[PDB]
């Protein structure tokens, strides 16, 4: 299974956060689909899930603000969270979740229908032993107990996660400037080029080079955040034209910036 989260990068405080998870891939089983988040610097937090019978379960701390629904026909599961605050800024992951009530027998007990040599009538017992001494040829000849229910949860497959920032600051598209080191390092065997993705809000941006034709030798660095609250980051490549492709989903803007070596000086 592949899971892809979609939704807003920036949500106004006090509004409803709504995300969608789209499941794709070659098959699906009985797994529930759920949501987990992780705030920067903090631990993973369960949000909730929906299973194939339509049962929802929520983190009791968030139950009153959460709604998880699905649409089988679109292979989609949704999450809405009401009245968000900055404390809800996080990476949000959807995930397939194993959720299963197991029937467990105690130590020493059998559960199959192989009753043992010369024995029969063990099949309708959950958990049984033929331990009295002789053959067991009736259900009442076995030691027996009803199975105990034991509940298993775990996350099977995870999405990549979608960053969600809850802030009252405005969406701000980046200014993209071309970088070149050649006027400094004088190297002509290699050229090192880059793009400065200046002064934007919120995270993230995506950067590619030559529309994905140039991947090796690309290094996109983590953003710095100034006290002003705007982000800047840079991407470099070591090497024909070279163009950095900067997408900022939050502003519906894409810039493809030509990066010329510009090794010279104009006085």
């Amino acid at each position: 299974v592949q899971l892809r989260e979609s939704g807003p990068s920036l949500v106004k405080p006090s509004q409803t956060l709504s995300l969608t998870c789209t499941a794709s891939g070659s098959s699906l089983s009985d797994e529930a689909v759920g949501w987990v988040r992780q705030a920067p610097g903090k631990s993973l937090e369960w949000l909730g899930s929906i299973d194939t019978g339509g049962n929802t379960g929520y983190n009791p701390n968030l139950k009153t603000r959460l709604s998880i629904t699905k649409d089988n026909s679109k292979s989609q599961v949704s999450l809405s969270m009401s009245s968000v605050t900055p404390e809800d800024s996080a990476t949000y992951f959807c995930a397939t979740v194993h959720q299963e009530t197991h029937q467990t027998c105690p130590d020493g007990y059998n559960s199959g229908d192989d009753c043992g040599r010369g024995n029969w009538d063990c099949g309708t017992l959950d958990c049984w032993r033929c331990d009295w001494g002789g053959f067991c040829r009736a259900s009442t000849d076995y030691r027996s107990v009803t199975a105990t229910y034991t509940y298993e949860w775990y996350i099977d497959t995870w999405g990549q996660g979608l960053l969600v920032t809850v802030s009252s600051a405005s969406t701000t598209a980046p200014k993209v400037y071309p970088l070149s080191s050649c006027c400094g390092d004088k190297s002509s065997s290699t050229v090192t080029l880059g793009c400065l993705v200046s002064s934007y809000m919120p995270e993230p941006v995506t950067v590619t080079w030559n529309s994905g034709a140039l991947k090796s030798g690309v290094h996109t660095f983590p953003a710095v955040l100034q006290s002003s609250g705007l982000y800047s980051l840079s991407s470099m490549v070591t090497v024909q034209t070279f163009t950095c492709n900067v997408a900022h989903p939050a502003s519906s803007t894409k810039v493809d910036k030509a990066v010329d070596p510009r090794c010279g000086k104009h006085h």
Binding site: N59, T101, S198, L233
Partner: protein, 216 residues
């Protein structure tokens, strides 16, 4: 936020073993079916163990889980640099009511090769200078361990005003990256002979220099 108690950090050397404990209560860990997850910077979270002891798809036998009552343990043997990550345990809480994660453990793998930083210094673009602004960008890559200090110079004077430097961030390879930005007026850029970014890592300094007489 965290419910199950884990050590905030553990370390072991290359080729050796480390154990991470996960301490809960009768309501979570004590009910069994503990799972474990590995989070590495480039990647989605990866399930390692479920059912206390079972390895997930693609997980090698040097990852092993156990549990005794309210405490579960992940052991990682034959440690490799690629095992550096944050590890989290988890379980159902009050069965189908809830799930809870641990507080997380950062694993450091000791004995890795020291790697000095690569430094690239970019001058301001013509385009930014046309708005009377100048940003110098110093990009620092492929260093290990993950601690640098960055000094900016102009014509031999240390500059601290309007410098912003990132923390070191762990790359795709256990090595680290950082960046530093010096924000000037176009006026200030043109008024100096040279600017330098001086990066110190384990007692060794790499310096790159750009000159307004040669750049932008």
């Amino acid at each position: 936020m965290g419910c199950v108690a884990q050590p905030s950090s553990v370390s072991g050397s290359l080729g050796q073993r480390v154990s991470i404990t996960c301490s809960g209560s009768s309501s979570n860990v004590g009910n069994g079916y503990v799972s474990w997850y590995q989070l590495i910077p480039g990647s989605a979270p990866r399930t390692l163990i479920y059912g206390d002891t079972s390895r997930a798809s693609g997980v090698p036998d040097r990852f092993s889980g156990s549990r005794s009552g309210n405490t579960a343990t992940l052991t990682i043997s034959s440690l490799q640099a690629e095992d550096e990550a944050d590890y989290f345990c988890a379980s159902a809480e009050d069965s189908s009511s809830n799930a809870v994660f641990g507080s997380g453990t950062t694993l450091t793998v000791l004995g890795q090769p020291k790697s000095p930083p690569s430094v690239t210094l970019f001058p301001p673009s013509t385009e930014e200078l046309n708005g009377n602004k100048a940003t110098l960008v110093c990009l620092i890559s492929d260093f290990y361990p993950g601690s640098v200090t960055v000094v900016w110079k102009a014509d031999g004077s240390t500059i601290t005003r309007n410098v912003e430097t990132t923390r070191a961030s762990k790359q795709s390879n256990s090595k680290y990256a950082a960046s530093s930005y010096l924000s000037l007026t176009s006026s200030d850029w043109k008024s100096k002979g040279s600017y330098s970014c001086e990066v110190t890592h384990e007692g060794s300094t790499v310096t790159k220099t750009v000159k307004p007489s040669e750049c932008s």
